[PDB]
């Protein structure tokens, strides 16, 4: 369950580049349908254009995921489309952005304990295009299991995992009004928040929310947190104490201010240590069947030609949940942490994720190194070569 924010209150009346992974969901061979995707993340504004391309055409009927941001801030977002490889076709994934003067094309490469409820809110003003798009997300344990998505005709919370539909009629409807509170608060902070940053009536702003609780086995709080963002930099956020507020400029200390006269701290720990803990605490039960499932990552390493006597060894590591993973390249014992390739971690679409780290060695000396994979869900790191 959310917690009812307060205004922001800070008054009366920089971009990043996105990045992008294009890679097949399964092993492409030919004549075999397979489903290609376009990871696109580290992006600020949230506002983007992703297309698909098939020798150079756009490809009609791409599917998107919903939009996510990151801890730093950041947005990230998937679209994938349904597609039969062939040795020829050429695929390509074209994203369009403000921070990029250029449509940035990206061609397809086919080369070979603890627990936490955090709700993760974003406010996105539409100057002349309509209301400000408003979201809540929840999450339990980087799963999310409840939406609020306020760019519908009767927007209403809804359950994002099949455990959530336990809830009854009057668990929805008080949610649902409560986002709908929010919206409103965050409607007028887009309003003041532009006097307080002199910036012109006409222009797109965001604000970005994380709130929440982590909790340990023992029903503890770990961490609390209600962070606060505009325009993707840091605005405020409570200090682990849960006493004090940190603000990351001018215009955030008057919400400082206006927060310590009120008594906003004393607010936010009152539900942290207990509405969050014990809201946290029913989604755990409710969800106990495949809420702490993992899938340890199965691997492989592939071998490919380069300049002369050199040869790449690439370490594969796919399928695995939860994201969090480590690939190592050792010769003679020692890591070569120095001189290796990695790829982001990147979803594959169907729940679980993929990583690869390659190394450049001498043709002929391919046996002389091991890739090493650790992850939660093995009873043991994995070690392989390359194998002809």
Not at 286 to 298: I, M, Q, V
Request: aromatic share 12%; charged share 25%; hydrophobic share 30%.
């Amino acid at each position: 369950s959310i917690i009812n924010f307060e205004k922001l209150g800070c008054g009366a009346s920089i971009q990043k580049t996105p990045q992008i992974q294009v890679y097949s969901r399964h092993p492409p061979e030919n004549g075999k349908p397979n489903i290609l995707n376009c990871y696109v993340t580290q992006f600020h504004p949230p506002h983007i254009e992703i297309q698909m391309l098939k020798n150079g055409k756009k490809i009609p009927k791409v599917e998107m995921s919903d939009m996510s941001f990151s801890k730093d801030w950041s947005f990230y977002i998937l679209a994938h489309t349904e597609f039969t490889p062939t040795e020829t076709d050429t695929y390509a994934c074209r994203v369009k952005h403000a921070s990029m003067a250029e449509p940035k094309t990206v061609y397809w490469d086919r080369d070979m304990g603890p627990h936490s409820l955090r709700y993760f809110v974003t406010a996105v003003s539409r100057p002349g295009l309509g209301e400000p798009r408003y979201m809540e997300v929840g999450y339990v344990d980087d799963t999310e299991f409840v939406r609020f998505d306020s760019d519908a005709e009767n927007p209403r919370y809804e359950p994002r995992a099949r455990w959530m539909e336990q809830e009854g009629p009057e668990y929805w409807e008080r949610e649902t009004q409560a986002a709908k509170g929010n919206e409103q608060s965050f409607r007028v902070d887009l309003r003041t928040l532009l006097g307080c940053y002199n910036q012109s009536k006409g222009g797109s702003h965001t604000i970005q929310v994380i709130s929440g609780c982590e909790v340990g086995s023992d029903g503890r709080l770990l961490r609390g947190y209600q962070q606060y963002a505009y325009d993707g930099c840091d605005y405020i956020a409570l200090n682990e104490d849960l006493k004090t507020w940190t603000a990351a400029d001018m215009a955030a200390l008057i919400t400082k201010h206006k927060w310590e006269q009120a008594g906003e701290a004393e607010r936010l720990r009152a539900y942290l240590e207990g509405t969050c803990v014990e809201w946290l605490r029913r989604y755990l039960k409710n969800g106990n069947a495949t809420l702490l499932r993992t899938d340890s990552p199965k691997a492989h390493v592939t071998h490919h030609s380069r300049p002369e006597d050199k040869v790449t060894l690439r370490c594969w590591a796919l399928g695995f949940y939860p994201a969090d993973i480590t690939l190592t390249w050792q010769l003679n014992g020692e890591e070569l942490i120095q001189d290796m390739e990695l790829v982001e971690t990147r979803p594959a679409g169907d729940g679980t994720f993929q990583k690869w780290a390659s190394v450049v060695v001498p043709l002929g000396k391919e046996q002389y190194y091991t890739c090493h994979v650790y992850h939660q869900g093995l009873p043991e790191p994995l070690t392989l070569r390359w194998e002809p």
